[PDB]
Amino acid sequence: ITDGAAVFASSEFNLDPGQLVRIVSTSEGTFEYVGLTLVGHRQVVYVD
């Protein structure tokens, strides 16, 4: 994160049921509001 902007950098990795995704801030930060939204891909499946 820099100047209120950010850059993403990472590889891919599969996520499975039960797994827990975590995020932490290494250093203290102050602001009014920050919004972070990721993206995933899931296979469409019908159910009952």
Binding site: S11, E12, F13, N14
Partner: protein, 50 residues
């Protein structure tokens, strides 16, 4: 029975000729099988029938 050994880079092949005629291609008329080599972290490298 030309044969590969030790997964070397060179692939097994057969080229046969007489004094006059040129060498014939054998793999050109074979049920060759490739693989779907991928850099993806989730491997889907199938053995697609070439």
């Amino acid at each position: 029975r030309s044969l590969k050994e030790g997964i070397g880079i060179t692939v097994s092949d057969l080229f046969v000729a007489t004094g006059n005629g040129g060498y014939q291609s054998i793999s050109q008329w074979e049920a060759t099988t490739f693989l779907y080599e991928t850099d993806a972290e989730g491997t889907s490298i199938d053995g697609g029938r070439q």
